[PDB]
Design an enzyme around this catalytic site. Structure first.
Site, PDB file in Angstrom:
ATOM      1  CE1 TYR A  81       1.024  -0.435   4.429  1.00  0.00           C
ATOM      2  CE2 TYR A  81       0.315   1.846   4.295  1.00  0.00           C
ATOM      3  CZ  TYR A  81       0.977   0.836   4.961  1.00  0.00           C
ATOM      4  OH  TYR A  81       1.590   1.096   6.165  1.00  0.00           O
TER       5      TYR A  81
ATOM      6  CG  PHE B 113       0.252   8.962   5.360  1.00  0.00           C
ATOM      7  CD1 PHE B 113      -0.286   8.751   4.104  1.00  0.00           C
ATOM      8  CD2 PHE B 113      -0.352   8.346   6.446  1.00  0.00           C
ATOM      9  CE1 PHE B 113      -1.386   7.934   3.934  1.00  0.00           C
ATOM     10  CE2 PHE B 113      -1.454   7.531   6.275  1.00  0.00           C
ATOM     11  CZ  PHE B 113      -1.967   7.325   5.018  1.00  0.00           C
ATOM     12  N   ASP B 114       2.707   7.233   4.015  1.00  0.00           N
ATOM     13  CA  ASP B 114       3.072   5.843   4.229  1.00  0.00           C
ATOM     14  C   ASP B 114       3.312   5.168   2.888  1.00  0.00           C
TER      15      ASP B 114
ATOM     16  CB  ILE C 158      -9.093   2.628   8.871  1.00  0.00           C
ATOM     17  CG1 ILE C 158      -8.440   2.572   7.488  1.00  0.00           C
ATOM     18  CG2 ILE C 158      -8.196   3.356   9.859  1.00  0.00           C
ATOM     19  CD1 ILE C 158      -8.306   3.923   6.820  1.00  0.00           C
TER      20      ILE C 158
ATOM     21  CG  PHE D 196      -5.022   3.794   1.372  1.00  0.00           C
ATOM     22  CD1 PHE D 196      -4.053   4.646   1.876  1.00  0.00           C
ATOM     23  CD2 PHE D 196      -6.052   3.390   2.205  1.00  0.00           C
ATOM     24  CE1 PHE D 196      -4.111   5.083   3.186  1.00  0.00           C
ATOM     25  CE2 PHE D 196      -6.115   3.825   3.514  1.00  0.00           C
ATOM     26  CZ  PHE D 196      -5.143   4.672   4.005  1.00  0.00           C
TER      27      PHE D 196
ATOM     28  CE1 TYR E  31      -5.219   6.491  12.256  1.00  0.00           C
ATOM     29  CE2 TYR E  31      -5.217   7.170   9.961  1.00  0.00           C
ATOM     30  CZ  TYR E  31      -4.756   6.345  10.965  1.00  0.00           C
ATOM     31  OH  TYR E  31      -3.829   5.369  10.677  1.00  0.00           O
TER      32      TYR E  31
END
Length: 106
Positions: free
Chosen positions: A26, A36-37, A56, A99, A82
């Protein structure tokens, strides 16, 4: 509210079921454009099991609806994310997440 666009054909007919492991590479970005990831930066597949609320709900539902050898982009609303209680120092409150999801096995 998750929007899925098939960016890969994904001819595999296998679908994730309850109580199974699932590997996804991902890559997430914030809708302005900063990421961010990225599991691929770690060179390790992200093993998560369907259920148990480990991830999530939007990510899990997106992974459930898409299959082996397939790639898609998930539009995650802050309601299923979130939201107001954002990640400390990572994701600002009330932000959407995109994503780059893809199974490899199971």
């Amino acid at each position: 509210g998750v929007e899925i666009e098939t960016i890969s054909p994904g001819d595999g007919r296998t679908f994730p079921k309850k109580g199974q492991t699932c590997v996804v590479h991902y890559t997430g970005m914030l809708q302005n454009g900063k990421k961010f990831d990225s599991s691929r930066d770690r060179n390790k597949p992200f093993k998560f099991r369907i259920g148990k609320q480990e991830v999530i709900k939007g990510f899990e539902e997106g992974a459930a609806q898409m299959s082996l050898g397939q790639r898609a982009k998930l539009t995650c609303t802050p309601d299923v994310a979130y939201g107001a209680t954002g990640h400390p120092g990572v994701i600002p409150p009330n932000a959407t997440l995109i994503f780059d999801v893809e199974l490899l096995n199971l």
